[PDB]
Every structure is written in C-alpha cells, then in structure tokens.
Design a protein around this ligand. Structure first.
Ligand code: LMP
Ligand code: ZN
Ligand code: ZN
Length: 216
C-alpha cells in the first residue's frame, strides 16, 4: 500500500522504491536505481507496476531529464513490471537475451533490445553490466558505477536469507557470489533489491547465505 518513493543517494544516483503484496512473502519492498549522466537518465530495474513506472519517469522528465533507456537485472516482475508501459512509450528497454527468453517462456512482455555480454559498458566508463553467474536466478546480473563505486546487486544480494528459491540455482550461487566479491571488492556501497544499503561485506554475507542454503 505505501507510495512509490524516490530518494537521492549521491549526485547522479537515486533509489526508487516500490511496494507490492505477493502471496506468502507479504508486502515486498523493492529498490531500483535511476542513474543520471549529464541530462541522460537511465532506469536500473523498473518498479513493480506501470503506474509507478510512469510516476518515476514523469518525476525525472519534469525536472529536465531525458529517459534514455531501461535495463532489467533479471526476469521476475519486481525488475520487469514496467517494461510494457515503457514500450508503449517508445522508451528503450534492455535485457539480456536469456532474460527475454525467460520473459517469453513465461508469457510476459519482453524488453525491446536483447544483448549477450558477460561484461560491457552500458554507458562507457559510467555504467557497467556484469553477469557473475546463476544465483537467485539463472539470468541475474548486476550494474556497476565506477565513478561512485556503487554496485546494484538486485535480487542476487541476499545478506539475511535467500528469498524466493523457485527459479534459483543453489549449486552455483556460492561460486557466483565469490566471483562477484572478487570483481567488486572495491565497492563503497551495495544496493540490493530488498535489503538496506550497505558496504562491500553485503557480498560476503550473501556468499555465506548462499552456502548455508545449498547445505539446506
Ligand atoms: C517475492 C520477491 C520477488 C520475487 C522474485 O524476484 O523472486 C518477484 C515478485 O519478483 N523477489 C524476491 C527475492 O527473493 O529476491 C521475492 S521474496 C521476498 C523479497 N524480499 C524478502 C527477502 O528478501 N527475504 C530474505 C526474506 C522476501
Ligand atoms: Zn527474482
Ligand atoms: Zn526480488
């Protein structure tokens, strides 16, 4: 029931938070990002709903910013919910090829654009996209802001319990978390889908929870 929130983290980085009841887990709080590169604005994951997605886009346009693209970090609706409404607005939506396949196979609107990298610049020297391996899902990826050393980990960062296991890969998640820890050990801030922002140790905690959950 709470409203969409938009808070500023540092210059150029905003967390958007949206809320949705999902059967069993109760009310889910979902964090995403909005990254500004001069007057360009990029959505890192969409809010749950078209409504909130529209509200978030209007909030930044009305302040003089151009929405230039969006990328979903994985296929579940807490990252993809607003894709359809953005397509109907010719706002470019991005997802990996696997994520669009998983959106396909389960009957949901796909992002307009597919890519197949494991690491690349979404915006050169500004926003990096990285796939550490399967974890929370087979397609989950992260986004890295080298200039603020902030990392968006999505639903892969689980410092207090792994969450929905339905599409997760328990065997791989520890190794993926180790790879993530080595890549981004220099992070100063780690934003996740559902936990409070923290420092680089959230990645260690995630590895521990991935390990505990494999063991059962
Ligand atoms: C229902 C959510 C959502 C779902 C998912 O991606 O699996 C879907 C609605 O988008 N993402 C989710 C996830 O585990 O990452 C789920 S579970 C819920 C999220 N915050 C809670 C949590 O993280 N705990 C450690 C208890 C539980
Ligand atoms: Zn998910
Ligand atoms: Zn989630």
């Amino acid at each position: 029931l709470p409203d969409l929130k938009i808070e500023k983290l540092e210059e150029g980085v905003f967390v958007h938070t949206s809320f949705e009841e999902v059967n069993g887990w109760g009310v889910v709080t979902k964090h995403g990002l909005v990254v500004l590169v001069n007057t360009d604005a990029y959505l890192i994951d969409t809010p749950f709903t078209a409504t909130d997605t529209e509200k978030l886009v209007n909030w930044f346009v009305e302040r003089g910013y151009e929405i230039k693209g969006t990328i979903s970090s994985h296929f579940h609706s807490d990252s993809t919910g607003g894709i359809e409404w953005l397509n109907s607005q010719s706002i470019p939506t991005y997802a990996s090829e696997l994520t669009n396949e998983l959106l396909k196979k389960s009957g949901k609107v796909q992002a307009k654009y597919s890519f197949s990298e494991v690491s690349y610049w979404l915006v050169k020297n500004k926003i990096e996209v990285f796939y550490p391996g399967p974890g929370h899902t087979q397609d989950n990826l992260v986004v890295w802001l080298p200039e603020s050393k902030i990392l968006f980990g999505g639903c892969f960062i689980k410092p207090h319990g792994l969450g929905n296991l339905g599409d997760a890969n328990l065997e791989a998640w520890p190794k993926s978390a180790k790879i993530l820890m080595s890549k981004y050990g220099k992070a100063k801030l780690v934003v996740s889908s559902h936990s409070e922002k923290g420092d680089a140790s959230l990645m260690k905690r995630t590895w521990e929870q991935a390990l505990k959950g494999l063991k059962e």
